[PDB]
Subunit: 295 residues, 4 copies
Amino acid sequence: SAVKAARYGKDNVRVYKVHKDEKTGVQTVYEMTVCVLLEGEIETSYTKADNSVIVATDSIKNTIYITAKQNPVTPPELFGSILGTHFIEKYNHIHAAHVNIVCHRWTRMDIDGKPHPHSFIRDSEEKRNVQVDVVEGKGIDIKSSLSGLTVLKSTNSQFWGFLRDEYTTLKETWDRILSTDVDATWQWKNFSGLQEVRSHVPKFDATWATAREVTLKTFAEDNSASVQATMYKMAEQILARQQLIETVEYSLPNKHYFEIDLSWHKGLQNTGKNAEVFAPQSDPNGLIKCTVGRS
Amino acid sequence: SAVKAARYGKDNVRVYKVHKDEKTGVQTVYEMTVCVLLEGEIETSYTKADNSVIVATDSIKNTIYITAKQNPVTPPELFGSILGTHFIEKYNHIHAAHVNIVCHRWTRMDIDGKPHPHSFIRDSEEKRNVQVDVVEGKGIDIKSSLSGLTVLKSTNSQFWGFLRDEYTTLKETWDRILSTDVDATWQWKNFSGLQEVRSHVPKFDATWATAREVTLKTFAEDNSASVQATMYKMAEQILARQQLIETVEYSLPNKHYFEIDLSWHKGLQNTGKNAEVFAPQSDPNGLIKCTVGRS
Amino acid sequence: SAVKAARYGKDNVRVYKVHKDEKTGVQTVYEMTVCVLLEGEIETSYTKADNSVIVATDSIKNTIYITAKQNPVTPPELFGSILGTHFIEKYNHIHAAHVNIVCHRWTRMDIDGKPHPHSFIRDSEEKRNVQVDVVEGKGIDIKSSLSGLTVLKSTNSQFWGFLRDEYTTLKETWDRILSTDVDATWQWKNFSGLQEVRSHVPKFDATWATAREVTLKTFAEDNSASVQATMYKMAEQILARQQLIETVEYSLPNKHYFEIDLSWHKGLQNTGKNAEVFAPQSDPNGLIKCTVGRS
Amino acid sequence: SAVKAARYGKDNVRVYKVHKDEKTGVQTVYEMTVCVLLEGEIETSYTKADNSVIVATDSIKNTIYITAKQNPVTPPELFGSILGTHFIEKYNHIHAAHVNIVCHRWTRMDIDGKPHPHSFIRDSEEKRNVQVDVVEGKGIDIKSSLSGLTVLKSTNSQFWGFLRDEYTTLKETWDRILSTDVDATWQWKNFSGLQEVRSHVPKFDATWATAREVTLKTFAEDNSASVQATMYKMAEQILARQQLIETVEYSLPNKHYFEIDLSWHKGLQNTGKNAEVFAPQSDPNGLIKCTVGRS
Ligand SMILES: O=C1N=C2NC(=O)NC(=O)[C@]2(OO)N1
Ligand SMILES: O=C1N=C2NC(=O)NC(=O)[C@]2(OO)N1
Ligand SMILES: O=C1N=C2NC(=O)NC(=O)[C@]2(OO)N1
Ligand SMILES: O=C1N=C2NC(=O)NC(=O)[C@]2(OO)N1
């Protein structure tokens, strides 16, 4: 037997950082959960009880905190690139570092209509994430995403013209609820190293903002023929607005809201044009995926 | 043996309702999770296999949806009062109805700076809740709350002067992080029935808004001596602003963010005035409670 | 305004303890999550920023670990009584200690049919809990429970003869699935102090074992007329087997499994006597409660 | 722009099935959660609002229940192969079906030392899973796994000889706690179709049992040099016991239990040989992975 694949490291590392402007008094906070997994010439730790090749996961944890102390933690694409680069440069025998960062929201409070200098609210469980793979001799591969963006529209969603056979019970509809939890990922052109990542730094926040804006506006405004058709429009627009993206991926649950026929009770009309009260379904759920690239 | 207490009903009933203004096209959505538990002359269902006294939980579910179809679902204090009153009026042998409602956020989207007529975002997992106890001959007892309001301030929190003995390791501090998940409850004067509840309807949304506003502003602005001292200020202000409240209760975790001494690594200074990177602690957590009333 | 109620302390304190028999080599592990909340002459911490009355929650945490080091952690009723007694004895101004313990399962592994001396499996997420309220001048009040015991029977559950009116759609049944998550609590006679608790120590494990045995056997063997009728039988049996219990409480969800009519597809018969494939319903769920005492 | 990848279907489909032996009265229950995602000539549903190519996810749900009615649901490898094969055979334009099944435990109760004919306990949240990818022209690729198997050993775990540099604070140890949640996957030789899968049916339950047995015994008996070294031994043993497996993958968190120095309190000794009370750490956690194949 032989080791065909191996990686190891520290997961679920919670990190907070504060920036304090002593001149203005304005403080800004960042909170993340970080995972770093390493690959390299580590097989003997598995096959021969050779711990000499192991950079302890505890040490990886320490390194995450040290790197956050010595560098900006934003944008997460940059921080993850710095962190991953560190491991492959510091340790000859480590040849890849896989850095996942989940960024938690701490939005500055407005109090009596003015932004507060040091108070924040978790205004959504929506996350901004990165997956930064630093692979020695193969640059830096970055996937950026937003996830946990939960939305609903109460009309201007349709679903008709789907295949009908002996397995089909679903009624066609021209007016339904659509709700989802958006998971949207944009995959960057490979970067050659940390200099090239740094050279594009403003594009990371800008592209995240674009992706979010396009997602919301397209969801709100598209009189949707299907989840498939709507999500494709989102992806093509994001690709058109950032040439350093190669692909955009969406993964969207269709979180069903079922009509409730109440006509058995005193002839109450609660379906079709009269539908007001619905049963949100926790499960099951449609799950619709696609990855869009350029032709 | 004998039945000393009993209640039963349907829990975890998800409910959506839409309102459609056909003139303007503006749609408004409401989503809840409802629990209704009944008490009454039901002991023989337990002791004698007498199901004749049981209003089936399935029927309670149906009734929740019917009541939502036939009545406003907002404010939740009103909806819960209507729903609870129904059971004690409809069924002679049912003498209490305990209605819990969790209201989920669906905040209208702004698209290109304009409110969208039918698209919504779950802008926070914060909930607005009610507990409405309709007890035959004893009116309607309502507890309103907000919960899951997660906040952090990066300075202007202190904790010194606490008891120090042989069990104490905690250092005094004059500048720390404070973060919590706010659970705040206001208990209304007993209402005699549904007419009296209806007579105060505007006060429910207004008092929720007050409670939220006071919580946020006091958290942001109080240079906090302790969680205890800050939460008391919140409660006393809410009591001063609504005379139909009898008590205000807060339950606040102290979600600790620990300094990380990095001085073992190249003399890095990350404590005290130099503290920038912290370790959020998932557990354990302080838990601080109080109920404030009028003197 | 004035403080009508207050308590505070440390929640979510994870604790592991090992016992090592150096003679035999057999090791035994215990794992808990502990919460201790204190009451007393603490109102000025809320009203006057008086921290002198606060035993820091950090110190309460330290005390939990010290007490676990210096005492048995089993049975949890005893450990909680020791821990609660400590606070009211050590601190003149503290007059109640509220101790909640959740015990996690670490069941010894059998390897090649022999119990292993130091290896364990989390064989269920079922918990054994206590709530120990030590109140100065009022002894020690203990509620013991088991929770998260998830069971299903595939027949020998019925539900017919329930009230039928204009809100009822549920069909009567003489053969259905019954599944629940058992939460069962037994409330002990008040104990005068720690000596009296200690004098009954063997009864704690014995009564937990009885409660579990009775729950399982009654669930399995009762051809159930309703959740109500079955749970009452469990409670009355437990009361008959331990005179130092005053009441037994059950809280049982009815975790519904719905038939699926497939007759629209090629006449497939999957209802009534032909029902084989069912749809487990995540929500909503019936919730059935009762507290049984002696007549 | 163009669709580079797409798949869609129904997720989170809960399924129960009962088998009833009318001769013996013994009933046996199965409960799963199923996901089926399809690929094929579906791009126009995304690009052109062409729903004609969509087999509705609702219909996929119906098909799961119909297939469970008409076929065995065990072993899950077989059920998933039947289900996946159905979609690629029934629909010309569908060319892959990706079937994930999570199997939930319903272990038969023993009551008064005898197996009960129709009562079951969720004896662990451990799962048995499959991932069955049926790809037209490319057979059936099956990955089988066990997950959520939570274990702890209180000694006979070591970790010393790891790399030490300026990022390292971790003390070497020759006696520590090791706890993990086992996720173990075995990847089968490609099968040509459903006949070949059926021809190996007994091997599925047998190999799952082997994997579980080896995991437990190796964990219990290996005086572990590291998670890496122990998990490799598990994988090599499983490969040696089933030649139709190509690889075995483990993913193991190192769920840390930290010593608590109590020497600040009355000289209490709770470290090293005197360590009895530990602090389980919820996060962060080491995460150790490897995939083992044959040389
Ligand atoms: O039943 C279905 N209903 C759906 N709606 C949709 O937009 N696309 C689908 O493919 C579908 O996803 O859930 N299938
Ligand atoms: O250690 C403590 N630190 C705290 N901070 C606080 O505001 N009050 C407390 O009572 C305390 O709550 O967590 N105890
Ligand atoms: O619809 C119902 N079905 C039930 N079954 C039951 O055992 N008791 C009830 O009161 C019931 O609880 O869920 N109500
Ligand atoms: O700090 C570490 N401690 C560990 N223990 C271990 O068995 N292997 C590691 O690589 C390690 O994983 O968590 N790193």
